[PDB]
Amino acid sequence: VWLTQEWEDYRLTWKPEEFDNMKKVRLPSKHIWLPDVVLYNNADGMYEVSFYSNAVVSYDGSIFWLPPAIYKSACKIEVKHFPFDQQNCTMKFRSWTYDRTEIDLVLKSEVASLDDFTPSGEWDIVALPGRRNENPDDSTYVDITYDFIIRRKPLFYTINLIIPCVLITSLAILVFYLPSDCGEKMTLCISVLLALTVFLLLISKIVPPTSLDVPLVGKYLMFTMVLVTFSIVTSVCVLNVHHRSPTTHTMAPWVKVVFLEKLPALLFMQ
């Protein structure tokens, strides 16, 4: 970013006709009074601007300072709708030297400027409004905060997570159509469960480890995993029933009545 800052210093005035009609001059920002405006919600502890470039001083005392900065700000990441999420990462600026009684911070524009912006490729800018805040109980507090509303482009994570998960989930039900004689039910259901677990773990590695909410995709994977565990237990039971003989089991009369007569009619089996 460029942290444009403008103020008036009455001590840096001159008459142009006495200096070959010069209207502005460049002064090193180290040698003039500055407002110590920095980022408060930074992570990594880097407050100040990067370079401390030169300031442009007009003959009437107006200062124009446009230093660059690389900022690492903390922001609350919402994972509920991942990977179709949109994030709201704020950016709070304050003077760490002077309070409201000494300097007042003011917004030049209600929105941040995109005049020299290079598109990211993975995140879309939606809005960049700025807002000035005072504390009615403090009276020495003032800040400017910009909300960065950005929207994820979901093609990458669609391709790499969503569609593989949909393909794997489509197989979670095939175990109940597989005949018990083919001797391969366990292979299928165990493979499905393990694949679902692997994708759940991958997602867990991608998203932040916060407990404020769960992603919808994670909830869906969890539900499917529980269903598939249930299917594995049921398939073990079905296999046990299938390999029964008169020399090891006796079929109770109610088993006949129900499973060979009533339930087949309900399910259209005959």
Binding site: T169, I173, Y177, L267, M269
Partner: peptide, 16 residues
Amino acid sequence: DRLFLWIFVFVCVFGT
């Protein structure tokens, strides 16, 4: 097996 197949079809389809 058929009964549980029906139940799973219903649960999965209603998992919207």
